[PDB]
Amino acid sequence: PRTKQSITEDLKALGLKKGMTVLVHSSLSSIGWVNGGAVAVIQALIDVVTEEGTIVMPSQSVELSDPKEWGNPPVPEEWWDIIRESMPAYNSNYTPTTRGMGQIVELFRSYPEVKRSNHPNYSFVAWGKHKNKILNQHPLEFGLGEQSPLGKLYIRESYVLLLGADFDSSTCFHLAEYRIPYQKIINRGAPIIVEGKRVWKEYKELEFREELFQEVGQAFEAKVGKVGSANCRLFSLTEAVDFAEKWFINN
Amino acid sequence: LKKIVESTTFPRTKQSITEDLKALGLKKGMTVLVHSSLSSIGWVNGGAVAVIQALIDVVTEEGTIVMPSQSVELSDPKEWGNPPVPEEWWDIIRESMPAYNSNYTPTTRGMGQIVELFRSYPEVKRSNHPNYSFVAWGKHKNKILNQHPLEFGLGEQSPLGKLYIRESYVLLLGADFDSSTCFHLAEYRIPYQKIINRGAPIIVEGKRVWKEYKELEFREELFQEVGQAFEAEHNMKVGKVGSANCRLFSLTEAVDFAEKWFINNDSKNI
Numbered sequence: 001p002r003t004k005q006s007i008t009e010d011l012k013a014l015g016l017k018k019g020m021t022v023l024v025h026s027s028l029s030s031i032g033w034v035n036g037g038a039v040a041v042i043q044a045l046i047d048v049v050t051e052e053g054t055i056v057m058p059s060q061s062v063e064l065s066d067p068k069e070w071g072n073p074p075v076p077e078e079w080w081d082i083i084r085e086s087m088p089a090y091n092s093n094y095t096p097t098t099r100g101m102g103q104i105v106e107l108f109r110s111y112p113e114v115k116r117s118n119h120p121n122y123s124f125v126a127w128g129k130h131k132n133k134i135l136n137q138h139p140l141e142f143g144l145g146e147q148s149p150l151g152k153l154y155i156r157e158s159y160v161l162l163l164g165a166d167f168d169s170s171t172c173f174h175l176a177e178y179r180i181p182y183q184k185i186i187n188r189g190a191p192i193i194v195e196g197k198r199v200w201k202e203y204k205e206l207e208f209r210e211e212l213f214q215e216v217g218q219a220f221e222a223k224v225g226k227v228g229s230a231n232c233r234l235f236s237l238t239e240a241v242d243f244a245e246k247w248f249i250n251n
Numbered sequence: 252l253k254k255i256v257e258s259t260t261f262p263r264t265k266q267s268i269t270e271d272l273k274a275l276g277l278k279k280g281m282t283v284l285v286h287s288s289l290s291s292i293g294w295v296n297g298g299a300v301a302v303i304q305a306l307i308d309v310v311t312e313e314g315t316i317v318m319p320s321q322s323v324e325l326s327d328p329k330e331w332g333n334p335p336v337p338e339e340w341w342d343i344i345r346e347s348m349p350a351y352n353s354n355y356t357p358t359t360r361g362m363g364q365i366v367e368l369f370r371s372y373p374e375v376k377r378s379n380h381p382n383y384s385f386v387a388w389g390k391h392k393n394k395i396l397n398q399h400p401l402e403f404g405l406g407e408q409s410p411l412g413k414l415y416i417r418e419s420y421v422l423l424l425g426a427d428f429d430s431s432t433c434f435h436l437a438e439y440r441i442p443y444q445k446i447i448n449r450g451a452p453i454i455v456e457g458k459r460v461w462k463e464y465k466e467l468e469f470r471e472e473l474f475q476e477v478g479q480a481f482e483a484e485h486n487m488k489v490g491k492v493g494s495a496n497c498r499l500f501s502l503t504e505a506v507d508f509a510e511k512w513f514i515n516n517d518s519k520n521i
Contacts, residue, residue, distance in 0.1 A: 001340045003347040036349040037324075037357060043349060063298075073253040075294075079262050086264040088297035088304065093373050095300065110371035111355050 002034035002228040007044035014161075014225040015234045016045070019052035021130060022159045023150070023172060023237060028103040030164025031228035038107040041163075046127065054128030056153065058171050059097045059109045064090050064120050066189040089191040089198045090120030100169075117149050120190040124149040130156065140192075140203050144171065145178030158237035164230030167217020168210065172237050176216075176244030177206055216247045252294075259293040263493035268295065268305035276488035276499045277306075282315040282391060283420045284433060284502060287365045291425025292493035299368045302424075307388065315389030317414065318366045319432045322356045325381050327450040350452035350459040351381035378410055381451040385410040391417070401453075401464045405432075406439030411506075419502040425495030428478025429471070433502045437509035438467055443517045481508045 016022070024045065034040040049055055067075050067083045075083070088095075093116070097105050108114055109125045117123045117135040122143035126135050134152050144150045150172055160172055167173075177183065184207040192201050220243045223234040277283065285306065295301050306316050325348065328341040336344070349356075354377075358367050366386070369375055375388045378396040383405045387395050395413040405411060411433060421433055428434075438444075445468040453462050481487075485508065487500040 001336075001344055001347075003343065004349060005347060035344050035347050039349050039352075039355055039357065073256050075256060075262075082262055082264070083296050086262070086266060086296050086301075088265060088300050094368065094371070096298070096368055107355065107357055 002032055002040070004036060004040050004044050004047070007031075007034065007041060007227055008047050010225070010227040011044060011048045014227060014232050015223040016048045016161065017053075018048070018050040020049055020159060021054040021056070021128075021153070021156055022049065022161045022234075023056040023058070023124075023153060024104075024161045024163060025058065025165035025169050025171070026102055026104045026162075027164035027230065030230040032230070034228060038104045041104055042108055042111060045161075049128070052129060054126060054130045054134065056124055056126045056128075056131075056134065056149070057105050057108055058101060059105055059116060059123045059125045060101055060121060061090060061095045061123065062098050062121050064095065064190045069188075084189070084191075084200055087191040087200075089193045091193065092116035092118050092123060095120075102165075104163075119143045119148075120192055121188075122148070140190075140201070142178065142205060144174045145206070146175075148175075150175050153237050154241055156237075160235055160237050160240055162233045163227055164232070166214065167220070167233075168214045170213065170217055170240065172241055173210075173213050173216055173244045174208060175241050176248060177208060179245045180248040182248065212248075212251075216244045219243070219247060255290055256294045259494065263293050263295040263301075265297060265301040265305045265308070268292070268302055268492055269308045271490070271492040272305060272309045275490040275492060275497055277309045277420075277422065278314075279309070279311040280313040280390075281310055281420060282317070282389070282414070282417065283310065283422050283499070284317045284319070284414055285365075285422045285424060286319070286426040286430040286432070287363050288425030288495060289364045291495035293495070295493065299365045300372075302365055303369055303372060310389065313390055315387060315391040315395070317385055317387040317392075317395060317410065317419075318369055319362060320358045320366055320370050320377060320384045320386040321362055321382060322351060322384065323359045323382050325351050325356065325451045330449075345450065345452075345461050348452045348461075350454045352454070353377040353379055353384065356381075380404045380409070381453055382449070383409065401462070403439060403466060405435045405469075406467070409436075411436040414502050415506055416503075420499050421502050421505060422497065422499050424492055424497050427475060428481075429475040431474055431478060431505065433505055434474050434477055434509045435469055435471070436506050437513055438469060440506075440510045441513045441517070443513070477509050477512050478505075480512055481505060 067080045114125050114127045115131050115135055116125045117138040119138045134149050139147050185204055186207045187202050188205045189202045310316050328336050328344045370386045375386050376392045376396050377386045378384045378399040380399045395410045400408050447468045449466045450463045487498050489498045
C-alpha cells in the first residue's frame, strides 16, 4: 500500500526539492492504491516542496464555453441559446474542474492555503510563497500566454512534474503557440461576473493544437523514475517551453 | 454523459430546477436535509453548482440546507470489504492513514457529486466527525454542526439531534429511502443495540492520533422498508425535479415512525 511517507520519499528520488517551483499534472490511479487517496499525494508534494517552494496545478473548466463548439458529447442545437442564457458564471471559489484534469486537482483546488486564478476556462491553482504573484492577474484574453500564470512561470526557474501524466497534457506547451509565426485567433465565449453581475463575454483566444503536444514533448526528451507505480518525468518549464517554440516554428 | 444528454428532452437549469423545487413543496426559510443524485435529474446546464444555487434560491438565506458528508473510508481496514484489503496491510494502513480534516477529507463516493461540491462551496460549514459528518449552509448551520461528538454521533448530540428538535424536512432528490440518513437516529431510541468498536485517524493537541470509539452497528438495510411503511399513512409530497423523482417529508415525523416500526418489529416479530 502506497503511503504519504512512501510517496514523499518516491518524489525526492525522482528529483523534487525543497523551495522548488513546479506545475503538476497527475493521475491518481496511475500511482496505484495510496492509503489516503488524493489527500495522500497532495500532502506528500506539500512536504517535499516545503512552504518555501510553490505547488502549482491546472484547474481548467472548459465546459463554461459556447455550446456551438461542444462535441464530447455534443448537444442539440436547439439548446445553445438557452444554454448560453442560463449558464452559471465562473467563480474560482466553486466552479469544478473539467474531468480530464484528474482527481488530485479537484481536491487540491479547495485544499487549505490553495488559491485560484480568475480565468473562466484556463485557471490555475497554487500553493506556496509565490502563489499570488503567479495568479494575481490572469487576463481573460489569451488565457495561457504572456501575462497568464503559465507566463509568469516561464520567467521563474520552474519545473513541470508529470505524475502518471503524459506530455499530451503539459499545458505549459501552450505558451509556445503564442510565440510562433502561426496563430489562428478566434472568438470564444464564457459566462462571467463583471462588476458584480453575470454576463456572457466573448473574447479572443488561440485555436490551439494540443494533439501535436505529444510529438513536441516526445522530441523534447530525445529526470524520470516512479512515484508509487506511476511513470514520472520531471523537467524544467523554461526549457520545455523554448523547445516547443522551436519545434512549431520549424514545422 | 452522452446518455444523460440524450435522455434529456431540454436542458434542466437553475431556474427550471428552482421552479420544480417550489412546485414540489420546498419553501423559503425551510431547513432541509438533502440526499441527491445529480444524474437522475437529466442533463443540467451548470451541473451541480446549478442545483446547489437552485436549492439556495428556494430556501433563501433564511432557510438552511444540510447534507450528509460521510467519509466512511477513514475506518479500521478490518471492517473493510468493498473491496477488502489483505490483512498484511491492516497495520501500516492504520499507521499511515491521513487524519480526518473538515477542510479536505473527500466524501464517500456514494454521497454524490453535489455533496462533494457543496462541501467546499462558499459559506458551507462541516461538522467535526471523521465518518458521519454533515455540511450545512444557512441561518442555522452553526447550531446544527457545532457540537458533533465522536461517540455515536449520528444519534443524540449529532446534527440529527438538531434536525429533530426544530422543524426540518428531508428531500430525496432522485434518491430513495435507503439513503435517508435521518432514520439512523431512531436506532438510538430503541431496545435493540449492537455496540461495535470503531477506529479512525484524528488530530488531537495538533498531532495525529488513531483513536477508538464505540458506535452502533446500523441496520440501514431496512431503511427502504421503513420508508415504504411510512408512506402508507404519512403526509409526503411527491413530484419531479427535472427528470428525477422526489419526495419531501418531515424529518421529525420520519424519525418517530422509524422508532416505532423498529420497536414493534424486533419485539412483536417472530
